[PDB]
Design a protein around this motif. Structure first.
Motif, short mmCIF file in Angstrom:
data_model
loop_
_atom_site.label_atom_id
_atom_site.label_comp_id
_atom_site.label_asym_id
_atom_site.label_seq_id
_atom_site.Cartn_x
_atom_site.Cartn_y
_atom_site.Cartn_z
N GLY A 94 1.15 -1.47 -0.06
CA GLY A 94 0.23 -0.02 0.26
C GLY A 94 0.69 1.72 0.01
N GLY A 95 0.73 2.32 0.46
CA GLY A 95 1.27 2.99 0.80
C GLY A 95 0.66 4.30 1.14
N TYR A 96 1.03 6.05 0.79
CA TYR A 96 0.64 6.95 1.42
C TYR A 96 1.22 8.00 0.47
CZ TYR A 96 0.09 4.47 5.62
OH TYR A 96 -0.91 3.56 6.29
N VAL A 97 0.46 9.22 -0.28
CA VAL A 97 0.58 10.23 -0.38
C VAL A 97 0.21 11.88 0.14
CG1 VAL A 97 -1.00 10.12 -1.95
CG2 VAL A 97 0.95 11.33 -2.70
N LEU A 98 1.04 13.11 0.02
CA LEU A 98 0.95 14.13 0.55
C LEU A 98 0.96 14.54 -0.36
CD1 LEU A 98 0.27 15.83 3.40
CD2 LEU A 98 2.64 15.93 3.65
N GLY A 99 0.25 16.16 -1.03
CA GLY A 99 0.01 16.96 -1.83
C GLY A 99 -0.13 18.16 -1.43
N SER A 100 -0.05 19.20 -2.76
CA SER A 100 -1.05 20.21 -2.60
C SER A 100 -1.48 20.72 -3.99
CB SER A 100 0.76 21.32 -1.91
OG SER A 100 0.92 21.41 -2.99
N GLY B 64 1.15 -4.39 -2.87
CA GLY B 64 1.26 -3.74 -3.83
C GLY B 64 0.48 -2.22 -3.82
N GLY B 65 1.37 -1.01 -4.15
CA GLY B 65 0.74 0.16 -4.38
C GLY B 65 0.95 0.92 -5.64
N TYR B 66 0.33 1.65 -5.49
CA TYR B 66 0.36 2.83 -6.81
C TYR B 66 -0.49 4.39 -6.50
CZ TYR B 66 -4.32 2.42 -7.67
OH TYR B 66 -6.25 2.35 -7.60
N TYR C 131 5.12 10.82 -1.95
CA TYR C 131 4.88 9.32 -1.79
C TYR C 131 5.78 8.31 -1.58
CZ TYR C 131 6.46 8.21 -6.46
OH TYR C 131 8.04 7.64 -7.22
N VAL C 132 5.26 7.44 -0.60
CA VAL C 132 5.61 6.18 -0.60
C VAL C 132 5.08 4.93 -0.40
CG1 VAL C 132 5.05 6.01 2.38
CG2 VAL C 132 7.60 4.84 1.34
N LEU C 133 5.41 4.35 -1.18
CA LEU C 133 4.45 2.40 -1.36
C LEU C 133 5.24 1.39 -0.88
CD1 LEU C 133 4.00 3.56 -5.69
CD2 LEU C 133 2.49 4.06 -3.60
N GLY C 134 4.55 -0.04 -0.55
CA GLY C 134 4.88 -0.70 -0.54
C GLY C 134 4.54 -2.03 -0.32
N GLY D 189 9.33 -8.22 -2.75
CA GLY D 189 8.89 -6.47 -2.38
C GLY D 189 9.79 -5.79 -3.07
N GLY D 190 9.56 -4.95 -1.65
CA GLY D 190 10.30 -3.80 -1.96
C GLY D 190 9.65 -2.56 -1.15
N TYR D 191 10.25 -0.99 -1.96
CA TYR D 191 9.31 0.39 -1.58
C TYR D 191 10.28 1.10 -1.98
CZ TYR D 191 9.31 -2.23 3.28
OH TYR D 191 8.20 -3.43 4.26
N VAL D 192 9.28 2.14 -2.04
CA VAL D 192 9.61 3.58 -3.59
C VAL D 192 9.05 4.69 -2.66
CG1 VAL D 192 7.54 3.14 -4.74
CG2 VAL D 192 9.55 4.78 -5.40
N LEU D 193 10.05 5.89 -3.04
CA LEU D 193 10.38 7.19 -2.10
C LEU D 193 10.20 8.13 -3.43
CD1 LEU D 193 9.14 9.11 0.32
CD2 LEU D 193 11.35 9.27 0.65
#
Lengths: 7, 7, 7, 7, 7, 7, 7, 7
Positions: free
Chosen positions: E1-7, F1-3, G3-6, H1-5
């Motif tokens: 999954g993940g997270y995003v922060l923007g403006s 996963g994530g997108y 953003y960060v994805l896993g 798997g993995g991570y991206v920022l």
């Protein structure tokens, strides 16, 4: 402004 | 998950 | 116009 | 426009 | 999954 | 996963 | 922004 | 798997 999303 | 739209 | 936030 | 985050 | 922060 | 997408 | 994805 | 920022 700002936003935050999670999944 | 999440989404945001603007117009 | 406007904005929408959902999941 | 907008943004979407999912899995 | 993940997270995003923007403006 | 994530997108993440933007427009 | 950021953003960060896993998986 | 993995991570991206990113931005």
């Amino acid at each position: 402004g700002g936003y935050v999303l999670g999944s």
